[PDB]
UniProtKB/Swiss-Prot annotation:
Involved pathway(s): Carbohydrate biosynthesis; gluconeogenesis
Post-translational note: Acetylated. Lysine acetylation by p300/EP300 is increased on high glucose conditions and promotes ubiquitination by UBR5; acetylation is enhanced in the presence of BAG6. Deacetylated by SIRT2. Deacetylation of Lys-82 is carried out by SIRT1 and depends on PCK1 phosphorylation levels. Phosphorylated in a GSK3B-mediated pathway; phosphorylation affects the efficiency of SIRT1-mediated deacetylation, and regulates PCK1 ubiquitination and degradation. Phosphorylation at Ser-81 by AKT1 reduces the binding affinity to oxaloacetate and promotes the protein kinase activity: phosphorylated PCK1 translocates to the endoplasmic reticulum, where it phosphorylates INSIG1 and INSIG2.
Residues that hold Mn(2+) according to the record: K235, H255, D302
Name this polypeptide is given: Phosphoenolpyruvate carboxykinase, cytosolic [GTP]
Region of interest (Omega-loop), residue spans: 445-466
Effect the entry attributes to changing S81A: Decreased phosphorylation and increased acetylation levels
Protein activity control: Phosphoenolpyruvate carboxykinase activity is regulated by acetylation and glucose levels. The anaplerotic conversion of phosphoenolpyruvate to oxaloacetate is improved by PCK1 acetylation on Lys-82 (K91ac), Lys-452 (K473ac) and Lys-500 (K521ac). High glucose concentrations favor PCK1 anaplerotic activity by triggering acetylation on Lys-82 (K91ac). At low glucose levels, SIRT1-mediated deacetylation of Lys-82 promotes the cataplerotic conversion of oxaloacetate to phosphoenolpyruvate. Phosphoenolpyruvate carboxykinase activity is inhibited by 3-mercaptopicolinate.
Biological classification of the source: Eukaryota, Metazoa, Chordata, Craniata, Vertebrata
Modified residues (Phosphoserine): S10, S81, S109, S277
NCBIfam families (UniProt xref): PRK04210.1 (NF003253)
Length: 601
């Protein structure tokens, strides 16, 4: 009975399966104390203050309740090399690649994982508090939401989980005897410390291992205190575990923003968009449009859970409660309404701080006053190496977004009418095109490539598939064999085409409102499209380009046979090597069709 060690809550208060999970791991990890989180502002403020006194975070004097954490530099980002999925058979997790090295995931046997686990977790929380974090991915009471319990020895994880998920006692009461995902996390630094603690940031990079066990409904993560390694809702649950749950249960879990868009006659539409990291999801989800009369409202900027309802609409919820955005590059110009979002109640990690107690990063586009001096993310004075680590983050509540859609917490989700794919392509790929069918659109997602190297990132999910990517494609195709399904139109965009001198052909940012209106009108059925080998593109003058000056539209939409011949050959060899026997017939057929259309142009 670990009851004697409970310093907040009680083990008798917990659903019985939750108690077994806490007590079983308390016996293994041997924490000094067990703190069952209630989600209250009191608990949150007191924990931040404790971390402040211990030197784990600093208060940002300038802002209302904002905080800065600087990590050990060895613990600065997700490590795909150390991120694994455990299943009986490797092929259920990744297609067996012809070449022998899969780019589509990382499998570990159950035997190898048991060994790794036993080498890590016994005694790992000695001298530390085990925090029990009950949380909901999605609005409380939503039929699309799912519940997890995270055990962690990191107060930084507790505070960040309060922002990024719905957390606390209300979640426990709603859970009852229902099912939940078991999330176990340890920074891997029992006390007394065996190694020196760097930057007062507990970390264990040599034993870092982020493991997913879909068949046991468990995520087990060790040795990292950072971001997606430790906030186990952020990706481990939201994409890897959930995409397997989604396959079994008939829905989709995707690396997509969700935004609502309204035309000047009051008609709203919701779009989802899958871009890879650093290709502009957050910017587009919080866009300030440049075109009069248009309104963009943010539902989510990173994760979408989507399920066809009984009437055939694709209903999407944002299962997150906040935004864990990349800070560098965020500015007045590029994302003014992210700037509004983060100036209160926000945790920053690995960005710089100004003399006046503010935040600073590359691309912030903010002249400071003469005299204002800057301290780097490595806690050293800095003069124009970057000031902020490139993967530095803000962690902010979504409720604060000045354009948060009124339905962003609606338990039924919002109806998705268009899905957008895209990434960074400096050559060959036009600004926008539309897929010819659902099957072709799935192929477009599967073929996605993104930027001195161009790499495949199908569906923007390369690091996050919870199971075999060929079966994932089959799952997407199966949505069409579902009577009533109102299959959304699929588009592919490229903000990043360059001319021969390396300059961006498209100014982008809020000017992407001009591409979104075109998509709006195609969903409406407007005849604004010209058929091409890769799909539909906007007709002559269909795109509203007034105010933009003389955009060089010839090259921005130029489709070159020689380029697309190379593209389709590259895609064929990629899918053959990496997907092989698990490539669905329909995707191979779309590939043959594209190759044939290209050969005839
Ligand atoms: N050229 C151009 N750059 C963009 C655009 N949108 C975003 N970016 C840049 O892409 C980088 C990453 O953007 P972010 O929204 O954090 O992408 P995310 O990490 O995929 O959500 C930022 O430095 C932006 O300045 C655009 O429309 N055009
Ligand atoms: Mn620190
Ligand atoms: Mn983002
Ligand atoms: Mn089919």
């Amino acid at each position: 009975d670990f009851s004697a060690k409970v310093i907040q809550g009680s083990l008798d208060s917990l659903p019985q399966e939750v108690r077994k999970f806490v007590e079983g791991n308390a016996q293994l990890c041997q924490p000094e104390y067990i703190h069952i989180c209630d989600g209250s502002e009191e608990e949150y403020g007191r924990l931040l203050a404790h971390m402040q006194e211990e030197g784990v975070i600093r208060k940002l004097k300038k802002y209302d309740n904002c905080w800065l954490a600087l990590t050990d530099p060895r613990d600065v980002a997700r490590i795909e090399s150390k991120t694994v999925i455990i299943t009986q058979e490797q092929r259920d997790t990744v297609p067996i690649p012809k070449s022998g090295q899969s780019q589509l995931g990382r499998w570990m046997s159950e035997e190898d994982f048991e060994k790794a686990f036993n080498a890590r977790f016994p005694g790992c929380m000695k001298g530390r508090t085990m925090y029990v974090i009950p949380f909901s991915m999605g609005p409380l009471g939503s039929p699309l939401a799912k519940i997890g319990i995270e055990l962690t020895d990191s107060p930084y994880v507790v505070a960040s989980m309060r922002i990024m998920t719905r957390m606390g006692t209300s979640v426990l009461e709603a859970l009852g005897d229902g099912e939940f995902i078991k999330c176990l996390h340890s920074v891997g630094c029992p006390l007394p410390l065996k190694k020196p603690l760097v930057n007062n940031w507990a970390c264990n990079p040599e034993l870092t291992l982020i493991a997913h066990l879909p068949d046991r409904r468990e995520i087990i993560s060790f040795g990292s205190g950072y971001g997606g390694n430790s906030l186990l809702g952020k990706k481990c649950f939201a994409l890897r575990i959930a995409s397997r749950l989604a396959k079994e249960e008939g829905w989709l879990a995707e690396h997509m923003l969700i935004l609502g868009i309204t035309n000047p006659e009051g008609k709203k539409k919701y779009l989802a968009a899958a871009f890879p990291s650093a290709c502009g999801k957050t910017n587009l989800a919080m866009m300030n449009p440049t075109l009069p009369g248009w309104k963009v409202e943010c539902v989510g900027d990173d994760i979408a859970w989507m399920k066809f309802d009984a009437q055939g609409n694709l209903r999407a919820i944002n299962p997150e409660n906040g935004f864990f955005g990349v800070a560098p590059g965020t500015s007045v110009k590029t994302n003014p309404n992210a700037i509004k979002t983060i100036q209160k109640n926000t945790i920053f990690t690995n960005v710089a701080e100004t003399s006046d107690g503010g935040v600073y990063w590359e691309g912030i586009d903010e002249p400071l006053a003469p005299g204002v001096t800057i301290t780097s993310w490595k806690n050293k004075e800095w003069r124009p190496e970057p000031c902020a680590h490139p993967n530095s983050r803000f962690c902010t509540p979504a409720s604060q977004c000045p354009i948060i859609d009124p339905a962003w917490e609606s338990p039924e989700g919002v109806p998705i009418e268009g899905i957008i794919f895209g990434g960074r392509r400096p050559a060959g790929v036009p600004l926008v095109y539309e897929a010819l069918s659902w099957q072709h659109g799935v192929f477009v997602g599967a073929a996605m490539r993104s930027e001195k190297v161009i790499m495949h990132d199908p569906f923007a999910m390369r690091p996050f598939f919870g199971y075999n990517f060929g079966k994932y494609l089959a799952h997407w195709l199966s949505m069409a064999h579902r009577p009533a399904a109102k299959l959304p139109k699929i588009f592919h965009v490229n903000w990043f085409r360059k001319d021969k001198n390396g300059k961006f052909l498209w100014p982008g940012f809020g000017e992407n409102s001009r591409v979104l209106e075109w998509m709006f009108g195609r969903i409406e059925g407007e005849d604004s499209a010209k058929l091409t080998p890769i799909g539909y593109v906007p007709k002559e003058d269909a795109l509203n380009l007034k105010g933009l000056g003389d955009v060089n539209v010839e090259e921005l939409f130029g489709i070159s046979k020689e380029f697309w011949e190379k593209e389709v050959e590259e895609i064929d060899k990629y899918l053959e090597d990496q997907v092989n026997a698990d490539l669905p017939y329909e995707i191979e057929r779309e590939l043959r069709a594209l190759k044939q259309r290209i050969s005839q142009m």
